[PDB]
Amino acid sequence: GPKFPRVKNWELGSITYDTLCAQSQQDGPCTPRRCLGSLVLPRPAEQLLSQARDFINQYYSSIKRSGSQAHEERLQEVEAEVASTGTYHLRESELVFGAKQAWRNAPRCVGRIQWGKLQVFDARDCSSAQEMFTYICNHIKYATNRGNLRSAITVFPQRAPGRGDFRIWNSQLVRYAGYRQQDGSVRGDPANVEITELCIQHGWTPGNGRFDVLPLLLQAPDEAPELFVLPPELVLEVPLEHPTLEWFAALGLRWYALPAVSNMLLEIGGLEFSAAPFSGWYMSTEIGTRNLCDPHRYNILEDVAVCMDLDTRTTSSLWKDKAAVEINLAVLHSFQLAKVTIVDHHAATVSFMKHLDNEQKARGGCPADWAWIVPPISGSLTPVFHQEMVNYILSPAFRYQPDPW
Amino acid sequence: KFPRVKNWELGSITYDTLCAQSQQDGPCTPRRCLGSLVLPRKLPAEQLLSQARDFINQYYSSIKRSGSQAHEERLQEVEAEVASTGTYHLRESELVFGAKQAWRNAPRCVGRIQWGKLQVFDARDCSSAQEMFTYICNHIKYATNRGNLRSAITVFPQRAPGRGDFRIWNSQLVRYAGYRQQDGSVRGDPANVEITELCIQHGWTPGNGRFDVLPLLLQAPDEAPELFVLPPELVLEVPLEHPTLEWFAALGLRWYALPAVSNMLLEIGGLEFSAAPFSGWYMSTEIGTRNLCDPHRYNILEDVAVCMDLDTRTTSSLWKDKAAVEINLAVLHSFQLAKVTIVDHHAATVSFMKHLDNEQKARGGCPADWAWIVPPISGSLTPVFHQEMVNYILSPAFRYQPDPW
Ligand code: HEM
Ligand code: HEM
Ligand SMILES: CCN(CCc1cccc(F)c1)Cc1cccc(NC(=N)c2cccs2)c1
Ligand SMILES: CCN(CCc1cccc(F)c1)Cc1cccc(NC(=N)c2cccs2)c1
Ligand SMILES: C[C@H](O)[C@H](O)[C@H]1CNc2nc(N)[nH]c(=O)c2N1
Ligand SMILES: C[C@H](O)[C@H](O)[C@H]1CNc2nc(N)[nH]c(=O)c2N1
Ligand SMILES: [Zn+2]
């Protein structure tokens, strides 16, 4: 065949070849001797200019003026600007295209069918922590939209030679506190124990419930982060109930509507946007399987199983599996009742399959991380399980970055 | 570099040093990860000699006698035979060691905690397809053991340069027929349509049910294959019923007790055993989820869901998930009732975690393929989902080989 990875779907028997992976200029963690695809985090003048040129070239193809006069005049401004300053700045339309392209490029994201519909708020004029807060509130208001969620990103000023970074310290805009107890256990979300404790060191007065919304810790360049409490009425939440298990409501479980990731770096054309929070909507398994059932998260499986009167003393009852199903159903049912957008793992995966086909035609491939794309319950019941995937890093991209502290 | 391997549930880290022993490239490169690919893309005396000495060294090291007269003399024998004849032969105790190690080293196998407990039948004095059948019947009978299943392997004569291979054309020793309809559909197991047709064509009289056991097509070097029908009493089957849903048994479903793979090549010390069928016992998800619920296998989700009166019109009822669970529950129950060995995915993945730990201590690592280890339902509900894994090829190994037609 062709000299590019051959990619097979074992359900359908169909074959494609990824030619896009050719465009990757950044190495992943695998070698011929060993595959490291399952690790979660694997561990410049001419350099900037060349990322810059490539990015501008991508922009000009996307509007189809490749080789044009406008294209070559932009390349020249970018070098001029780097020549005299070490950096450059993006046109507004370049930032919009780049932000959508970073989403499109994210191998781990199963919601990419939506990649073309992203509201980009340009906040590159922001000059204080107070102003970041207003921008974030506006973001949350627009995105939440009383339950009819809308994808969005708000982009704060880029990293700049020898000035401090803009950062949001929280990993998401909405997170529940986790309080370490005398007996070593955690009340709330154990994932958020470090951020919780940071908030307290910075003057936050902590509550003591299981679902306390954290304040944001926002850092403008060369300053200590400042603490901001989110108006409760801006944080839409969904109380959890089950469509037929009437006791489920009695458990007092809830989840917030808006997933908004705030600690990633958006890299476009070599420019680095250290604060660039983005939001979409939830796939139901993120709440109902990982957040509520991981043993290191809320860990509610056994409590639910006991309420369902299952035999929890033996693996072979499938008590875990039965409980997880029902918790997932409650999540979907409750969001539905509340009119808050949510997508189940079947509908998400079907639409990711359609994404794959669309991208096969547009770009000759789609970077995808199979372990993250396949959901955490009912894997082989989804069509993605049966689909081979090629994982690689393209840019623009969202990257992890180290923590500000 | 040596990889760091993190468990995300317990926060523990290990380093894999065993991967340095890999002499054999996988599908990945720094530009792209191809770990989700099922099959490899591709599929002299000095090189045999070095795989040979390496394997001889592994064996003596394993019985402690590394550097003894015996050890040096055995290296000379291997050297003398290769130098003169281009090939060599294993001693039975080496073959036994090498077969156990190949299982040990299989990165896709979740059952490796059992690796040291393997009955090895040496069938290298086999000269006809007639004799392969007898050995195969004895393997089935031994390994079945009236339901108290015992892991086993039978090793037929190695490949030899001058001639065709010994081969078992079937992919397993027990497979159900798949009969294509003139209108595209299939009766029985659509995975087996092609072998089914080969059987008819070599003169099998076909059945017309959903669970007809195939004859074996056994091939001695450079001869047409011959057909052998397995005596029904050797093939232990389990009717499927549900512990509480009485209509479930009405579905007429059943599975065989003995999973015995018969198309993989066993490689030991550079020598290749093209026919080396091996067997153990089932993990219940292999039947319950994949074989019965894959859309391209028996595809019974809908029918179960209908019998359970679930709402089938909408993915967000989680009908697929609920039916899958019950079906896996039926398998486990029916195997337990029939007193036939099986293991559920929770118990299996817990055992594998233990294995990871034994192997860390014994060898500095454990090659494992995360997409194959994590089960096809309730992924994140098992500990393996949260465990990073490093995939690589050690030898002895089980490999794929081309189909003999
Ligand atoms: C429109 C609805 C969307 C859905 C349902 C969705 C779904 C998901 C899910 C389930 C994950 C895996 C998360 C996990 O297990 O922790 C994910 C990863 C991701 N998605 Fe989305 N996505 C959506 C929109 C977005 C948007 C708007 C962006 C950015 C503009 C985005 C970027 C990402 C990135 C960067 C990751 C990877 C995070 C990491 O590597 O840690 N997605 N997506
Ligand atoms: C004793 C119980 C055993 C259990 C429960 C078990 C379980 C499994 C499972 C569930 C798979 C994945 C199969 C699939 O999804 O298609 C598998 C793969 C495998 N196991 Fe086992 N295993 C067992 C014993 C053995 C033995 C005795 C051998 C060889 C002597 C073996 C060698 C393999 C190999 C080579 C694979 C990989 C097949 C491939 O890559 O296509 N296992 N194991
Ligand atoms: C629970 C944490 N998720 C990343 C997982 C992670 C990664 C690295 C280190 C960690 F500790 C944890 C966050 C995440 C990221 C991206 C998307 C989603 N879920 C969503 N539905 C979206 C969030 C923003 C737009 S869609 C969650
Ligand atoms: C269902 C198919 N499995 C092979 C997967 C495969 C690989 C390549 C191409 C395919 F079409 C399919 C068979 C298999 C292999 C190894 C182990 C098992 N299951 C078992 N429990 C055992 C079989 C033998 C010992 S344990 C199944
Ligand atoms: C070790 C393993 O990579 C890790 O637990 C992954 C697996 N797949 C995932 N998939 C998604 N979508 N989210 C995750 O956090 C993870 N965790
Ligand atoms: C494409 C993907 O690798 C493929 O569907 C794999 C995934 N994980 C698997 N895991 C097991 N145990 N058996 C399988 O056949 C597969 N199939
Ligand atoms: Zn890889």
Tab-separated table of N, CA, C and O in Angstrom, chain A residues 2 6 10-11 17 21-22 24 27-28 30-36 38-40 43 289-290 294 315-316 318 320-322 326 329 332 336 344-346 370-371 376 378-380 385-386 388-392, chain B residues 4 8-9 19 22 25-26 28-34 36-38 41 289-290 294-296 315-316 321-322 324 326 329 332 336 344-346 370-371 376 378-381 385-386 388-392:
chain	number	residue	atom	x	y	z
A	2	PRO	N	0.164	2.380	0.369
A	2	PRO	CA	0.811	3.664	0.625
A	2	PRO	C	1.746	3.651	1.852
A	2	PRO	O	1.512	2.886	2.789
A	6	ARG	N	-1.487	2.621	8.097
A	6	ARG	CA	-2.777	2.029	7.731
A	6	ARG	C	-3.610	1.849	8.974
A	6	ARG	O	-3.146	1.269	9.953
A	10	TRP	N	-12.342	-2.505	12.669
A	10	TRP	CA	-12.607	-3.946	12.740
A	10	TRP	C	-14.129	-4.295	12.779
A	10	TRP	O	-14.528	-5.430	12.561
A	11	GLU	N	-14.968	-3.316	13.078
A	11	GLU	CA	-16.383	-3.521	13.027
A	11	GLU	C	-16.797	-3.576	11.553
A	11	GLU	O	-17.423	-4.522	11.129
A	17	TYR	N	-5.659	5.525	5.388
A	17	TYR	CA	-4.211	5.803	5.580
A	17	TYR	C	-4.078	7.244	6.063
A	17	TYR	O	-4.706	8.172	5.504
A	21	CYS	N	-0.329	12.865	9.665
A	21	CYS	CA	0.695	12.653	10.671
A	21	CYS	C	2.066	13.096	10.184
A	21	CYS	O	2.988	13.235	10.967
A	22	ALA	N	2.178	13.218	8.861
A	22	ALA	CA	3.283	13.808	8.138
A	22	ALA	C	3.597	15.243	8.571
A	22	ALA	O	4.751	15.697	8.498
A	24	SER	N	3.086	16.520	11.617
A	24	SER	CA	3.554	16.627	12.995
A	24	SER	C	5.020	17.066	12.937
A	24	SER	O	5.793	16.481	12.151
A	27	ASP	N	7.613	15.529	18.607
A	27	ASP	CA	7.686	14.118	18.985
A	27	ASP	C	6.761	13.785	20.146
A	27	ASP	O	6.554	14.613	21.042
A	28	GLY	N	6.157	12.593	20.085
A	28	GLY	CA	5.406	12.046	21.227
A	28	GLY	C	6.435	11.213	22.005
A	28	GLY	O	7.639	11.260	21.700
A	30	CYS	N	6.655	7.699	22.242
A	30	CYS	CA	6.937	6.277	21.779
A	30	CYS	C	8.166	6.174	20.911
A	30	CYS	O	8.503	7.123	20.173
A	31	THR	N	8.851	5.034	21.035
A	31	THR	CA	9.918	4.626	20.126
A	31	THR	C	9.575	3.229	19.518
A	31	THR	O	8.633	2.520	20.023
A	32	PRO	N	10.326	2.829	18.440
A	32	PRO	CA	10.203	1.449	17.904
A	32	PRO	C	10.379	0.363	18.990
A	32	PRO	O	9.664	-0.655	18.977
A	33	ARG	N	11.291	0.591	19.944
A	33	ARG	CA	11.526	-0.380	21.032
A	33	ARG	C	10.318	-0.442	22.042
A	33	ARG	O	10.024	-1.527	22.561
A	34	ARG	N	9.622	0.680	22.305
A	34	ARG	CA	8.511	0.655	23.275
A	34	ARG	C	7.418	1.731	23.129
A	34	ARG	O	7.658	2.924	22.812
A	35	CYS	N	6.204	1.283	23.410
A	35	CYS	CA	5.066	2.120	23.302
A	35	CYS	C	4.656	2.655	24.671
A	35	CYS	O	4.367	1.884	25.616
A	36	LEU	N	4.545	3.988	24.713
A	36	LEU	CA	4.237	4.731	25.934
A	36	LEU	C	2.921	5.488	25.716
A	36	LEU	O	2.653	6.500	26.395
A	38	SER	N	0.056	4.872	26.677
A	38	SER	CA	-0.821	4.930	27.867
A	38	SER	C	-0.365	5.873	29.023
A	38	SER	O	-1.096	6.014	30.010
A	39	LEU	N	0.838	6.476	28.959
A	39	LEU	CA	1.169	7.442	29.975
A	39	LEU	C	0.284	8.638	29.816
A	39	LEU	O	0.041	9.107	28.715
A	40	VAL	N	-0.220	9.133	30.936
A	40	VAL	CA	-0.985	10.406	31.006
A	40	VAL	C	-0.208	11.712	30.692
A	40	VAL	O	-0.648	12.556	29.898
A	43	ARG	N	6.907	12.916	30.136
A	43	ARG	CA	7.877	14.012	30.544
A	43	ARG	C	8.773	14.493	29.415
A	43	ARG	O	8.312	15.263	28.574
A	289	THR	N	-19.323	8.175	35.737
A	289	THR	CA	-18.299	7.159	35.978
A	289	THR	C	-17.016	7.687	36.691
A	289	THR	O	-16.663	7.193	37.766
A	290	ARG	N	-16.329	8.679	36.148
A	290	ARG	CA	-14.987	9.028	36.704
A	290	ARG	C	-15.199	9.839	37.967
A	290	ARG	O	-14.796	9.394	39.038
A	294	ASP	N	-14.683	6.943	40.570
A	294	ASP	CA	-13.247	6.567	40.741
A	294	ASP	C	-13.027	6.373	42.205
A	294	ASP	O	-13.537	7.163	43.001
A	315	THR	N	-17.071	-10.186	43.598
A	315	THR	CA	-16.958	-9.494	42.308
A	315	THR	C	-18.009	-10.019	41.296
A	315	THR	O	-18.524	-9.244	40.478
A	316	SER	N	-18.278	-11.315	41.342
A	316	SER	CA	-19.049	-11.963	40.278
A	316	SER	C	-20.532	-11.625	40.227
A	316	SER	O	-21.162	-11.987	39.250
A	318	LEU	N	-21.323	-8.616	39.706
A	318	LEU	CA	-21.317	-7.409	38.896
A	318	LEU	C	-21.988	-6.204	39.530
A	318	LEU	O	-22.520	-5.340	38.857
A	320	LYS	N	-20.632	-3.631	40.880
A	320	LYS	CA	-20.038	-2.385	40.475
A	320	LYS	C	-20.563	-1.942	39.186
A	320	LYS	O	-20.843	-0.775	38.981
A	321	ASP	N	-20.675	-2.875	38.281
A	321	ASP	CA	-21.082	-2.512	36.925
A	321	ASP	C	-22.549	-2.018	36.938
A	321	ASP	O	-22.918	-1.084	36.245
A	322	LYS	N	-23.365	-2.701	37.725
A	322	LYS	CA	-24.823	-2.374	37.816
A	322	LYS	C	-25.031	-1.030	38.445
A	322	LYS	O	-25.719	-0.191	37.898
A	326	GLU	N	-26.412	2.764	36.793
A	326	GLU	CA	-27.533	3.516	37.286
A	326	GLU	C	-27.083	4.919	37.624
A	326	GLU	O	-27.818	5.870	37.438
A	329	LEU	N	-27.078	6.782	34.476
A	329	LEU	CA	-28.434	7.089	34.027
A	329	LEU	C	-28.959	8.293	34.785
A	329	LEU	O	-29.607	9.213	34.196
A	332	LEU	N	-27.599	11.569	33.300
A	332	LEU	CA	-28.262	11.921	32.057
A	332	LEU	C	-29.676	12.390	32.297
A	332	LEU	O	-30.062	13.459	31.849
A	336	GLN	N	-31.004	16.282	31.633
A	336	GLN	CA	-32.186	16.356	30.776
A	336	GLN	C	-33.348	17.102	31.402
A	336	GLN	O	-33.830	18.070	30.841
A	344	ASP	N	-24.533	11.721	26.076
A	344	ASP	CA	-24.150	10.406	26.504
A	344	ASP	C	-23.052	9.831	25.647
A	344	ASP	O	-22.706	10.371	24.568
A	345	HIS	N	-22.463	8.746	26.149
A	345	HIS	CA	-21.243	8.195	25.559
A	345	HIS	C	-21.484	7.492	24.289
A	345	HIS	O	-20.559	7.327	23.534
A	346	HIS	N	-22.742	7.072	23.993
A	346	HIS	CA	-23.042	6.493	22.708
A	346	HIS	C	-23.152	7.532	21.642
A	346	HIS	O	-22.594	7.380	20.562
A	370	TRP	N	-6.551	6.643	21.622
A	370	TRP	CA	-7.687	5.638	21.695
A	370	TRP	C	-8.083	5.437	23.162
A	370	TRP	O	-9.244	5.392	23.538
A	371	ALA	N	-7.083	5.467	24.041
A	371	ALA	CA	-7.378	5.178	25.456
A	371	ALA	C	-8.270	6.226	26.156
A	371	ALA	O	-8.997	5.934	27.145
A	376	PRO	N	-15.129	5.226	29.662
A	376	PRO	CA	-14.728	4.422	30.822
A	376	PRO	C	-15.746	3.354	31.287
A	376	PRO	O	-15.382	2.537	32.096
A	378	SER	N	-18.545	0.581	29.193
A	378	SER	CA	-19.216	0.129	27.975
A	378	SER	C	-18.391	0.329	26.713
A	378	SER	O	-18.886	0.441	25.601
A	379	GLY	N	-17.083	0.305	26.905
A	379	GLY	CA	-16.170	0.504	25.820
A	379	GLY	C	-16.490	-0.107	24.468
A	379	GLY	O	-16.617	0.608	23.488
A	380	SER	N	-16.585	-1.416	24.419
A	380	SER	CA	-16.808	-2.098	23.143
A	380	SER	C	-18.245	-1.990	22.634
A	380	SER	O	-18.556	-2.510	21.516
A	385	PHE	N	-14.293	1.937	20.072
A	385	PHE	CA	-13.500	0.822	20.472
A	385	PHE	C	-12.889	0.048	19.321
A	385	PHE	O	-11.722	-0.454	19.452
A	386	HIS	N	-13.642	-0.063	18.201
A	386	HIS	CA	-13.367	-0.986	17.086
A	386	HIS	C	-12.558	-0.286	15.983
A	386	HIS	O	-12.180	-0.880	14.976
A	388	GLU	N	-9.171	1.597	14.963
A	388	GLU	CA	-7.742	1.981	15.127
A	388	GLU	C	-7.570	3.485	14.973
A	388	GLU	O	-8.328	4.142	14.225
A	389	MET	N	-6.590	4.055	15.718
A	389	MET	CA	-6.378	5.483	15.777
A	389	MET	C	-4.848	5.715	15.824
A	389	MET	O	-4.139	4.864	16.302
A	390	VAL	N	-4.399	6.832	15.261
A	390	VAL	CA	-2.932	7.213	15.160
A	390	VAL	C	-2.855	8.452	16.007
A	390	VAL	O	-3.656	9.372	15.818
A	391	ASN	N	-1.955	8.461	16.978
A	391	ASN	CA	-1.845	9.576	17.857
A	391	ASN	C	-0.551	10.383	17.525
A	391	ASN	O	0.518	9.822	17.287
A	392	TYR	N	-0.684	11.690	17.460
A	392	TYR	CA	0.431	12.581	17.138
A	392	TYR	C	0.066	14.012	17.481
A	392	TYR	O	-1.109	14.386	17.621
B	4	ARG	N	9.201	5.932	33.482
B	4	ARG	CA	8.455	6.066	34.719
B	4	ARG	C	7.011	5.649	34.457
B	4	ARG	O	6.452	6.067	33.472
B	8	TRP	N	-2.358	6.117	38.751
B	8	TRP	CA	-3.107	7.366	39.043
B	8	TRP	C	-4.096	7.225	40.237
B	8	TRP	O	-4.470	8.200	40.872
B	9	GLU	N	-4.486	5.995	40.565
B	9	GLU	CA	-5.381	5.747	41.709
B	9	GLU	C	-4.542	5.799	43.075
B	9	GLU	O	-4.952	6.408	44.071
B	19	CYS	N	12.297	-3.174	29.698
B	19	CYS	CA	12.187	-2.806	28.239
B	19	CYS	C	13.539	-2.734	27.514
B	19	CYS	O	13.589	-3.033	26.315
B	22	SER	N	14.302	-5.615	25.179
B	22	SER	CA	13.619	-5.779	23.869
B	22	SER	C	14.595	-5.638	22.650
B	22	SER	O	15.382	-4.667	22.542
B	25	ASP	N	11.473	-4.459	17.342
B	25	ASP	CA	10.694	-3.241	17.253
B	25	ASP	C	9.185	-3.462	17.166
B	25	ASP	O	8.732	-4.405	16.527
B	26	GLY	N	8.423	-2.567	17.813
B	26	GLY	CA	6.940	-2.479	17.680
B	26	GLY	C	6.592	-1.465	16.588
B	26	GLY	O	7.469	-1.052	15.848
B	28	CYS	N	5.426	1.714	16.749
B	28	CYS	CA	5.541	3.153	17.063
B	28	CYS	C	6.873	3.843	16.673
B	28	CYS	O	7.962	3.217	16.578
B	29	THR	N	6.739	5.155	16.420
B	29	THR	CA	7.856	6.063	16.204
B	29	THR	C	7.583	7.338	17.014
B	29	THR	O	6.458	7.555	17.515
B	30	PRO	N	8.624	8.162	17.191
B	30	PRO	CA	8.455	9.454	17.885
B	30	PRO	C	7.399	10.401	17.247
B	30	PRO	O	6.691	11.100	17.995
B	31	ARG	N	7.340	10.447	15.902
B	31	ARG	CA	6.304	11.220	15.155
B	31	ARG	C	4.821	10.750	15.404
B	31	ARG	O	3.936	11.603	15.435
B	32	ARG	N	4.585	9.435	15.576
B	32	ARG	CA	3.225	8.850	15.801
B	32	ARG	C	3.185	7.505	16.557
B	32	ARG	O	4.013	6.583	16.320
B	33	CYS	N	2.228	7.421	17.482
B	33	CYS	CA	1.873	6.204	18.212
B	33	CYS	C	0.786	5.405	17.458
B	33	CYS	O	-0.293	5.954	17.155
B	34	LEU	N	1.090	4.114	17.247
B	34	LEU	CA	0.272	3.146	16.514
B	34	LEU	C	-0.085	2.004	17.438
B	34	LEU	O	-0.359	0.886	17.002
B	36	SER	N	-2.759	1.354	18.984
B	36	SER	CA	-4.159	0.777	18.917
B	36	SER	C	-4.334	-0.183	17.749
B	36	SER	O	-5.365	-0.831	17.651
B	37	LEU	N	-3.351	-0.235	16.853
B	37	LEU	CA	-3.336	-1.213	15.783
B	37	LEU	C	-3.358	-2.662	16.355
B	37	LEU	O	-2.551	-3.036	17.212
B	38	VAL	N	-4.305	-3.470	15.862
B	38	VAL	CA	-4.410	-4.923	16.223
B	38	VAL	C	-3.267	-5.869	15.704
B	38	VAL	O	-2.800	-6.741	16.433
B	41	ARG	N	2.117	-4.143	10.742
B	41	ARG	CA	1.931	-3.647	9.380
B	41	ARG	C	2.544	-4.664	8.402
B	41	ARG	O	1.885	-5.061	7.422
B	289	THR	N	-19.456	-9.884	26.531
B	289	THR	CA	-19.432	-8.613	25.847
B	289	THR	C	-19.048	-8.761	24.374
B	289	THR	O	-19.753	-8.326	23.440
B	290	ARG	N	-17.822	-9.245	24.121
B	290	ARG	CA	-17.345	-9.222	22.755
B	290	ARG	C	-18.148	-10.250	21.872
B	290	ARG	O	-18.677	-9.878	20.889
B	294	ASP	N	-20.658	-7.685	20.288
B	294	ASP	CA	-20.100	-7.007	19.158
B	294	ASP	C	-21.098	-7.007	18.017
B	294	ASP	O	-21.729	-8.019	17.757
B	295	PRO	N	-21.198	-5.904	17.286
B	295	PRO	CA	-22.170	-5.748	16.175
B	295	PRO	C	-21.855	-6.658	15.005
B	295	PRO	O	-22.777	-7.085	14.272
B	296	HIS	N	-20.583	-7.004	14.895
B	296	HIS	CA	-20.078	-7.858	13.856
B	296	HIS	C	-19.870	-9.304	14.352
B	296	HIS	O	-19.278	-10.121	13.683
B	315	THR	N	-30.336	6.492	22.662
B	315	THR	CA	-29.150	6.032	23.369
B	315	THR	C	-29.167	6.414	24.878
B	315	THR	O	-28.510	5.754	25.741
B	316	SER	N	-29.822	7.533	25.193
B	316	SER	CA	-29.653	8.107	26.541
B	316	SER	C	-30.386	7.345	27.669
B	316	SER	O	-30.125	7.591	28.841
B	321	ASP	N	-26.132	-0.569	27.654
B	321	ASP	CA	-25.272	-0.831	28.835
B	321	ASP	C	-25.967	-1.812	29.747
B	321	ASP	O	-25.336	-2.695	30.332
B	322	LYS	N	-27.287	-1.608	29.913
B	322	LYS	CA	-28.038	-2.472	30.842
B	322	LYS	C	-28.135	-3.871	30.314
B	322	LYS	O	-27.980	-4.827	31.059
B	324	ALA	N	-26.026	-5.258	28.223
B	324	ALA	CA	-24.690	-5.919	28.280
B	324	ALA	C	-24.431	-6.479	29.651
B	324	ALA	O	-23.944	-7.599	29.856
B	326	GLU	N	-26.462	-7.544	31.980
B	326	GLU	CA	-27.187	-8.785	32.251
B	326	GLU	C	-26.644	-9.959	31.532
B	326	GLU	O	-26.707	-11.117	31.997
B	329	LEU	N	-23.573	-11.075	33.264
B	329	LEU	CA	-24.092	-11.815	34.413
B	329	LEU	C	-24.619	-13.266	34.073
B	329	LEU	O	-24.357	-14.266	34.781
B	332	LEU	N	-21.504	-15.614	33.565
B	332	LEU	CA	-20.869	-15.950	34.822
B	332	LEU	C	-21.700	-16.971	35.589
B	332	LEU	O	-21.185	-17.959	36.080
B	336	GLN	N	-20.840	-20.865	36.300
B	336	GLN	CA	-20.784	-21.288	37.726
B	336	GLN	C	-21.679	-22.452	37.998
B	336	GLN	O	-21.271	-23.395	38.639
B	344	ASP	N	-14.312	-13.456	36.253
B	344	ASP	CA	-14.902	-12.194	35.888
B	344	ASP	C	-13.775	-11.182	35.723
B	344	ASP	O	-12.612	-11.426	36.176
B	345	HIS	N	-14.110	-10.074	35.066
B	345	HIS	CA	-13.136	-9.006	34.771
B	345	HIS	C	-12.598	-8.243	35.977
B	345	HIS	O	-11.503	-7.670	35.929
B	346	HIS	N	-13.353	-8.232	37.062
B	346	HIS	CA	-12.877	-7.618	38.291
B	346	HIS	C	-11.861	-8.519	38.900
B	346	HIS	O	-10.748	-8.066	39.230
B	370	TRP	N	-2.231	-1.766	27.218
B	370	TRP	CA	-3.300	-1.215	28.031
B	370	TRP	C	-4.709	-1.411	27.363
B	370	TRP	O	-5.618	-1.803	28.032
B	371	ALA	N	-4.830	-1.197	26.069
B	371	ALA	CA	-6.117	-1.311	25.347
B	371	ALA	C	-6.652	-2.700	25.385
B	371	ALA	O	-7.914	-2.895	25.355
B	376	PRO	N	-13.684	-4.688	28.192
B	376	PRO	CA	-14.513	-3.932	27.254
B	376	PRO	C	-15.855	-3.389	27.838
B	376	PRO	O	-16.566	-2.656	27.132
B	378	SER	N	-16.989	-1.542	31.803
B	378	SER	CA	-16.673	-1.118	33.136
B	378	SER	C	-15.117	-0.838	33.298
B	378	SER	O	-14.597	-1.072	34.325
B	379	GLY	N	-14.514	-0.361	32.237
B	379	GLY	CA	-13.023	-0.045	32.164
B	379	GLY	C	-12.542	0.543	33.457
B	379	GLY	O	-11.834	-0.125	34.207
B	380	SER	N	-13.008	1.739	33.754
B	380	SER	CA	-12.495	2.503	34.874
B	380	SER	C	-12.883	2.019	36.241
B	380	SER	O	-12.382	2.491	37.256
B	381	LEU	N	-13.842	1.093	36.267
B	381	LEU	CA	-14.215	0.356	37.430
B	381	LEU	C	-13.218	-0.707	37.832
B	381	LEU	O	-13.424	-1.289	38.918
B	385	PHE	N	-7.308	0.198	34.651
B	385	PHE	CA	-7.588	1.396	33.890
B	385	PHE	C	-6.671	2.510	34.362
B	385	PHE	O	-6.355	3.322	33.557
B	386	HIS	N	-6.330	2.533	35.647
B	386	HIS	CA	-5.624	3.659	36.291
B	386	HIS	C	-4.132	3.440	36.343
B	386	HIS	O	-3.401	4.319	36.822
B	388	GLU	N	-0.716	3.040	34.312
B	388	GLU	CA	0.189	3.138	33.170
B	388	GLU	C	0.922	1.833	32.894
B	388	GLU	O	1.353	1.109	33.802
B	389	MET	N	1.090	1.575	31.595
B	389	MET	CA	1.721	0.353	31.090
B	389	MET	C	2.603	0.631	29.903
B	389	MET	O	2.345	1.579	29.137
B	390	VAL	N	3.659	-0.202	29.775
B	390	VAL	CA	4.732	0.024	28.798
B	390	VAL	C	4.598	-1.229	27.958
B	390	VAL	O	4.688	-2.299	28.498
B	391	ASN	N	4.438	-1.087	26.648
B	391	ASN	CA	4.311	-2.225	25.745
B	391	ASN	C	5.587	-2.427	24.970
B	391	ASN	O	6.072	-1.474	24.345
B	392	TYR	N	6.075	-3.672	24.918
B	392	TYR	CA	7.243	-3.974	24.126
B	392	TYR	C	7.309	-5.473	23.913
B	392	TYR	O	6.679	-6.219	24.655
